[PDB]
Amino acid sequence: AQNPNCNIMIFHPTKEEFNDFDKYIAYMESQGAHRAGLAKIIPPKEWKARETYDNISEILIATPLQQVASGRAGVFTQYHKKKKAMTVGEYRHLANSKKYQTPPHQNFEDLERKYWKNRIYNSPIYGADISGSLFDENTKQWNLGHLGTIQDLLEKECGVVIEGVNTPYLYFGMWKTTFAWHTEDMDLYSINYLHLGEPKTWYVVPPEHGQRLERLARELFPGSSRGCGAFLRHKVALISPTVLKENGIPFNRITQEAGEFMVTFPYGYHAGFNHGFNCAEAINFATPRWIDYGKMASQCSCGEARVTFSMDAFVRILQPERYDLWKRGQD
Ligand SMILES: O=C(O)CNC(=O)C(=O)O
Ligand SMILES: [Mg+2]
Ligand code: NI
Ligand SMILES: [Zn+2]
């Protein structure tokens, strides 16, 4: 078995290897990459997502989210308070302000320490889930706006034609902006490209050990657990590396820098934070190996997790028994 310790692997494809996305994902899995839940892909040096980022300031963040924390430093939840719209230029200025900017630090480890120590005492503002792309249409390789669609994958593998579309989303981050512990909708893959700015630190649990994280989360967030049998789908709970170590949960961590891709694999729980002003783009995708994960994916039926139009069809076709109750949650 390749990669038996489930380490995060880092890949450096050549420009030739960067042509066929599906084939490279399948290559990575042949080397065991999926066992970690997360992989880093450094693009060939010849490749670029677009020519410059000089003209992005007028993108609108229609609903910036203020991430308010509750709990203790290593075990907290966050709630997203909606704020008034602002441009990316306005947001970058805010991110760079004295109130929100990254503190002085020695290296990524010292900044990680400061994040876990101090995150709860601040409420950074996140521009998340903004439909759109920053890839130039002329970028032909690993262009997250030109991937094959999950609906087309399901059709190719299973023969069923379904409605729905699959488009990317932009994320504008600042210091301390946080992504809570989650897997993807329907335990899909994700791919995330850090277009610009400061790094993003990731933590991940190997898929084969995801239930260990779930069991800890039910112990640590006991009222949330009683309220919903898949409450990590709410994307609000954080647990620090120190806490994970204290409870024997297997995990790994890695820092993504501008110009790098990360891939999350089916049922790879992940969480993380941004080091400073940055912009990422991400999208879900599928492969043949995903299908069985999609069939087994948990679902939130309490009604909090409230998810896309396109997830309907996935549930309907892959989880017909759940369909009924899950759609009661979504209506
Ligand atoms: O970058 C973020 O805030 C969150 N991204 C992801 O969870 C991802 O790409 O799967
Ligand atoms: Mg603009
Ligand atoms: Ni994710
Ligand atoms: Zn729920």
285, β-bridge pairs: 189
At 212, phi and psi to the nearest 5? -65, -40
Q: Going by DSSP bridges, is the β-strand pair 278-285/9-11 parallel, antiparallel, or unpaired?
A: unpaired
274 annotated as a binding-site residue: no
Closest-CA residue, ligand 1 atom 2, reads 179
**82 has binding-site annotation:** no
**Which amino acid appears at position 231 of this protein?**
F
Domain ranges, residue 195? 1-331
147 contact partners, CB below 8 Å, separation of at least 6 = 21, 166, 191, 283, 285
279 lines ligand 1 (CB under 6 A): no
Nearest to 175 by CA among 252, 268, 103: 103
* Residue 51 Rama label (left phi>0; alpha psi -120 to 50; beta): alpha
Q: What protein residues have CB closer than 5 angstroms to ion ligand 3?
A: 190
Distances (CA, A) of 290 to 157, 165, 188, 189, 240: 10, 18, 7, 8, 28
CA distance 39 to 34: 7
Structure tokens at 330: 């979504």
Of 199, 181, 188, 200, the closest CA to residue 271 belongs to 181
Q: Quickly count: other Cβ atoms within 10 Å of residue 4's Cβ.
A: 8
Angle at which helices 309-318 and 320-329 pack, to 10 degrees? Answer: 150
Cβ–ligand 1 distance for 203 under 6 Å, the answer no
Sheet arrangement for strand 252-256: 178-182, 269-274, 200-205, 252-256
Q: Is 280 in the pocket of ligand 1 (CB under 6 A)?
A: yes
**Dihedrals φ, ψ of 115, to 5°?**
-60, -55
Q: How many CA atoms lie within 13 A of 190 on its CB side?
A: 24
Give me ligand 1 centre to Cα 159, in Å: 30
Sequence length of the chain is: 331
Q: How was this structure determined?
A: X-ray
Q: How far is CA 107 from CA 82, 112, 113, 260, in A?
A: 32, 9, 10, 19
Q: Is 6 annotated as a binding residue?
A: no
Handedness of CA 237, 241, 246, 252 (dihedral sign): positive
Question: CA 278, CA 52: separation in Å to the nearest integer?
Answer: 15
Q: What is the 3-state secondary structure (H, E, C) of the chain?
A: CCCCCCCCEEECCCCCCCCCHHHHHHHHHHCCHHHHCEEEECCCCCCCCCCCCCCCCCCEECCCEEEEEEEECCEEEEEEEECCCEEHHHHHHHHCCCCCCCCCCCCHHHHHHHHHHHHHHCCCEEEEEEECCCCCCCCCCCCCCCCCCHHHHHHHHHCCCCCCCCCCEEEEECCCCEEEEECCHHHCEEEEEEEEECCEEEEEECHHHHHHHHHHHHHHCHHHHHHCCCHHHHCCEEECHHHHHHCCCCCEEEEECCCCEEEECCCCEEEEEECCCEEEEEEEECCCCHHHHHHHCCCCCCCCCCCCHHHHHHHHHHCHHHHHHHHHHCC
The token pair at 285 is 């995708």
Q: Print the SS3 string covering 54-83.
A: CCCCCCEECCCEEEEEEEECCEEEEEEEEC
For ligand 1, say whether the CB of 264 is within 6 Å of any of its atoms: yes
Is 179 a pocket residue for ligand 1 (Cβ < 6 Å)?
yes
Q: Residues with Cβ within 5 Å of ion ligand 2?
A: 56, 58
Number of domains in the chain: 1
The verdict on the CB of residue 143 being under 6 Å from ligand 1 is no
What gap in Å lies between CA 183 and CA 30, rounded to an integer?
A: 22
* Cβ count near 285 (within 10 Å): 21
Q: Is 126 annotated as a binding residue?
A: yes
What is the CATH classification number for the domain harbouring 170?
A: 2.60.120.650
Could you tell me if 251 and 204 are in contact, meaning their C-beta atoms sit under 8 angstroms apart?
yes
Atom of ligand 1 nearest to the CA of 179: 3
Query: Atom 4 in ligand 1: which residue has the minimum CA distance?
Result: 179
What residues contact 273, with CB distance under 8 A and at least 6 apart? 115, 119, 176, 177, 178, 179, 200, 201
Quickly count: other Cβ atoms within 10 Å of residue 8's Cβ.
20
Amino acid at 275: H
Residue located nearest, by CA, to atom 10 of ligand 1:
190
Q: Which residues contact 287 (CB under 8 A, 6 or more apart)?
A: 22, 25, 26, 153, 189
Q: What separation in Å is there between the alpha carbon of 159 and the centre of ligand 4? A: 31
**10 phi and psi, to 5 degrees?**
-120, 130
Cα–Cα distance for residue pair 68/79, rounded to 1 Å: 5
Q: Is any ligand 1 atom within 6 A of the Cβ of residue 65?
A: no
Query: Is-contact 123 67, C-beta < 8 A?
Result: yes
> Ligand nearest 329 Cα, by number?
4
